[PDB]
Write a protein that binds this DNA or RNA. Structure first.
Ligand SMILES: [Mg+2]
Length: 847
RNA sequence: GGGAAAUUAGGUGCGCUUGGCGUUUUAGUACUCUGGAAACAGAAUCUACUAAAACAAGGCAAAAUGCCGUGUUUAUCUCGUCAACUUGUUGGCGAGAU
DNA sequence: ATTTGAATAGGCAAGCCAAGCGCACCTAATTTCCCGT
DNA sequence: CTTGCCTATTCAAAT
């Protein structure tokens, strides 16, 4: 409306506060908070890490299947071949001397390809008894294999230590290939197999993709070839967008940086203080092309002037004068000093590019040979083994080759030479943040902040001033100096400037607000609720009044009530579906399926889990039923060393021997985990068909919710949970599964004559028996409970300020007792609306 | 006061390539029980090792260093319009209401 | 008068860590340059 | 740290 105002903003990690104030009177108009989930780097790190893991497991499986096909082709494996009881460590060690059977031979080759070592680990030759260090383990093993093969060492441990697998099982692929070559050398005699077989098999075994190949064809994450790969990555020029930067060590790029140094030099001479063309020419030719690292003495001699006269040079942290080093010139000169080659800039830029862009020597050699030069194959092979070619210059070659003559002649700054030689928008576009790169956290707070400003400009018209305060991860250091804060205000100032809108964007320092709170006696406390973020914003906005022209104004701020909250609602499909862990099940005495649990860490000083379990519930142990003799043997220990936390710890401490299974001759194995009956099985995902002939049931737990759809059925409120498992990707859209959905309604006994009321997503707003909350989820589908939270404060904090000691969670049962359920919604500003729903639930979701 | 480049040292993010593990099932062997002079047969499925297989539910693809599946964006409803495939819904744009 | 069912309180558990690579951007120190308060 | 979901405990209503 007509009235003119200021807009405060308190940008935060989870929140954007906003405050709006009359420009004349400084009375509060409005104020509110927009709350969101902190954008944690952990989240995407998770997504990426798991995508990596899925490819590793896919590639192992596909390598095993490529081996099998080769064994089918050379008629060593069939559909009806018994590989079942063939110890491959025996077969590996046997087949390095004697004839294997086709089955033993197939067993062995398949065992090698499954598990084939590292390829990128060099010796450290150090041992500080670190179990988890790959480098230290790889080295300890390298020593063990001086005289023997991996399978020899592996069979030795199987027999001495009783086991092979684990942390000590870390070997180099080259150690495995040495074995395979020997195995195939012996076996070639007795089996019909040829050099094609042997070459093929070792390729399968040793080969893997490189970091600069990346995925195969289909991938959204892939790329066609190395240049595409590098082009995608590298940055763009400042003065000529749509041109990729130069590589750091191109001849013209280093020569550019060389000239700027010399142009900066100031000398106390009778003639001109700055260097002349001829002087610069002879300095470059005699110093920068002769000496690898120019020194001030060597420059001083060429001029024929004392060192102290020359001033205005780059200085190392130590104190030495620093001058640019021509990398490529020297690198190639050192290989071959032919004037045809090393006095040709265009070639020396090409060689540099190739050396930066290509990664392996054998790729560089081809790319140089295709370059069609006067270089010899001997020279090319030396070039291809050069190091340290990375990175980019800030300018493109286009930009450098433009101004190289001006730097040669005039003693000018680069900026001076380049100096010499949004309007269609209605609202602030949110893509502009994406242009410049930020912390994932901050990028989210900012996208929200622009969406919040847009919504105010719409509702109230343009502000006179906008003011900003970011959260920190009488004095005049108020203008905030952080890359993000600068970035934001540059975005905004640009926008208003272009579209010709008189708006004064500003900022103030994080600390400053706190000072005014102390000054005007206004205690900050998260205790109260989310309102603190908003009443930060209103303070910021009143600092604007102080930076133009008090009890009464701050009385308005402090006594103000009509705050507004806008929690963001997540509707994204295909989030995490379920928890990773797998659980076995068992039917107990009463005929109840139960999850099986495990007690690990039995021999730890402060672990009372088993002692608690034995005293409470001895019948929950599976060995209570199944190994009674070992049970009685364990009970005598618990009675012996009752007084301590962990009776078994004393058993290990005093005698120096882990607890073994009962046996007549004292040769039962150690006990290291104990299985016992845990919770009853209700809500689960059944994965038992992945395990053919599993006796019991194999399950996963924590079905994670997508939404719940409320229905009103003959005066009774009811609801369905829709799981994320119930939602399925099609071509360009997700679909809620119809069969799962009608099944779900049937377990809930929801009639065909029942009216759909609403769908509730996470953070959707719900009014239950006249009380408004935000939705968290479905506590129990079966019992018909939904977890909610409060709006203005977390229920945890509501109980703390009360000093109440209940559980800090709200659960609400939806039942015949429930009288009304209504859905509400807020705009981004927190204006609240009772909202209408469609006639049916949503099935398609294009976003 | 703001912006820019170079050098050295560290950090952050996106992406890629690997390795040993871990969870779980089936089998074998050891441990237990029963029978047998013994080999061994059966019972038990508990404790341990080894192999093979699965590991967000799934979806493609078809001999292939094969590919995707946990991130980001995300108040609601109506009308107009363009589009989409699911053929009456849900996306973009615009307008309105809540 | 005792037993059965609802509601509230109480509590448990959730995959991991080591090796390598590209590019981008930030900070700090030092020197120089270009615009202006 | 939060959330999905089970167990156990306490009080009121029905046989
Ligand atoms: Mg705040």
């Amino acid at each position: 409306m007509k009235r003119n105002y200021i807009l405060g903003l308190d940008i935060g990690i989870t929140s954007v506060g906003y405050g709006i104030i009359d420009y004349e009177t400084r009375d509060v108009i409005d104020a509110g908070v927009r709350l969101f989930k902190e954008a944690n780097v952990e989240n995407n790190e998770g997504r990426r890490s798991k995508r990596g893991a899925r490819r590793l497991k896919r590639r192992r499986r596909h390598r095993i299947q490529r081996v099998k096909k080769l064994l089918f082709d050379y008629n060593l494996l069939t559909d009806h071949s018994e590989l079942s009881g063939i110890n491959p460590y025996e077969a590996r060690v046997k087949g390095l001397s004697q004839k294997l059977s086709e089955e033993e031979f197939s067993a062995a080759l398949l065992h090698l390809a499954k598990r084939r070592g590292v390829h990128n680990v060099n010796e450290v030759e150090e041992d500080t008894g670190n179990e988890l260090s790959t480098k230290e383990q790889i080295s300890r093993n390298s020593k063990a294999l001086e005289e023997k093969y991996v399978a020899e060492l592996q069979l030795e441990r199987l027999k001495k230590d009783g086991e092979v697998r684990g942390s000590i099982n870390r070997f180099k692929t080259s150690d495995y290939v040495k074995e395979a070559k020997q195995l195939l050398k012996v076996q070639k005699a007795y089996h019909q197999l040829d050099q094609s077989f042997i070459d093929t098999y070792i390729d399968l075994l040793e080969t893997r993709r490189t970091y600069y190949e990346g995925p195969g064809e289909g991938s959204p994450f892939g790329w066609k070839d190395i240049k595409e790969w590098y082009e995608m990555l590298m940055g763009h020029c400042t003065y000529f967008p749509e041109e990729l930067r130069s590589v750091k060590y191109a001849y013209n790029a280093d020569l550019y940086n060389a000239l700027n140094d010399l142009n900066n030099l100031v000398i106390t001479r009778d003639e001109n203080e700055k260097l002349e063309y001829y002087e610069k020419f002879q300095i470059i030719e005699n110093v920068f092309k002769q000496k690898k690292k120019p020194t001030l003495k060597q420059i001083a001699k060429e001029i024929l002037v004392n060192e102290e006269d020359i001033k205005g040079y780059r200085v190392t942290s130590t104190g030495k004068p620093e001058f640019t080093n021509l990398k490529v010139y020297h690198d190639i000169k050192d290989i071959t000093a032919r004037k045809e080659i090393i006095e040709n800039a265009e070639l020396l830029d090409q060689i540099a590019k190739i050396l930066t862009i290509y990664q392996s020597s054998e790729d560089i050699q081809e790319e140089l040979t295709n370059l069609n030069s006067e270089l010899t194959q001997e020279e090319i092979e030396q070039i291809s083994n050069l190091k340290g070619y990375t990175g980019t210059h800030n300018l493109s070659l286009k930009a450098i080759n433009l101004i190289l003559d001006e730097l040669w002649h005039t003693n000018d700054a680069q900026i001076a030479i380049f100096n010499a030689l949004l309007s269609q928008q209605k609202e602030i576009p949110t893509t502009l943040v994406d242009d410049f790169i930020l912390s994932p956290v901050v990028k989210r707070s900012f996208i929200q902040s622009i969406k919040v400003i847009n919504a105010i400009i719409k509702k109230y018209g343009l502000p006179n001033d906008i003011i900003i305060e970011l959260a920190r991860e009488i004095n005049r250091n108020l203008v905030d100096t952080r890359y993000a804060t600068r970035g934001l205000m540059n975005l905004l100032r640009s926008y208003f400037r272009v579209n010709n809108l008189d708006v004064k964007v500003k900022s103030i320092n994080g600390g400053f607000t706190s000072f005014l709170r102390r000054k005007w006696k206004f205690k900050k406390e998260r205790n109260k609720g989310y309102k603190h973020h908003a009443e930060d914003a209103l303070i910021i906005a009143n600092a604007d009044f102080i930076f133009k022209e008090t009890p009464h104004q701050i009385k308005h701020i402090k006594d103000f009530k009509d705050y507004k909250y806008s929690h963001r609602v997540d509707k994204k499909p295909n989030r995490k579906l379920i928890n990773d862990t797998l659980y076995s099940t068992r039917k107990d005495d009463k005929g109840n399926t139960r999850i099986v649990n495990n007690l690990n860490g039995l021999y730890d000083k402060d672990n009372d889990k088993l002692k608690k379990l034995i005293n409470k519930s001895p019948e929950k142990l599976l060995m209570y039923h199944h190994d009674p003799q070992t049970y009685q043997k364990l009970k005598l220990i618990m009675e012996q060393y009752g007084d301590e936390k962990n009776p078994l710890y004393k058993y290990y401490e005093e005698t120096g021997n882990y607890l073994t299974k009962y046996s007549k001759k004292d040769n039962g194995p150690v006990i290291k985990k104990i299985k016992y009956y845990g919770n009853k099985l209700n809500a689960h995902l059944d994965i038992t068909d992945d395990y053919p002939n599993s006796r019991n049931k194999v399950v996963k737990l924590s079905l994670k919710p997508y939404r719940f759809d409320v229905y009103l059925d003959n005066g009774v409120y009811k609801f369905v949970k829709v799981n994320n498992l119930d939602v399925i990707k099609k071509e360009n859209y997700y679909e809620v599964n119809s069969k799962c959905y009608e099944e779900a309604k049937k377990l809930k006994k929801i009639s065909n004559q029942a009216e759909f009321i609403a769908s509730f997503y996470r953070n959707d707003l719900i009014k239950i028996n006249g009380e408004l909350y935000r939705v968290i989820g479905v506590a129990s589908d079966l019992l018909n409970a939904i977890e909610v939270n409060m709006i203005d404060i977390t229920y945890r904090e509501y109980l703390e300020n009360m000093n109440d000691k209940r559980p800090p969670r709200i659960f609400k049962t939806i039942s015949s007792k429930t009288q009304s359920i209504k859905k509400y919604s807020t705009d981004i500003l927190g204006n609240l609306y009772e909202v209408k729903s469609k006639k049916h639930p949503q099935i398609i979701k294009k976003g």
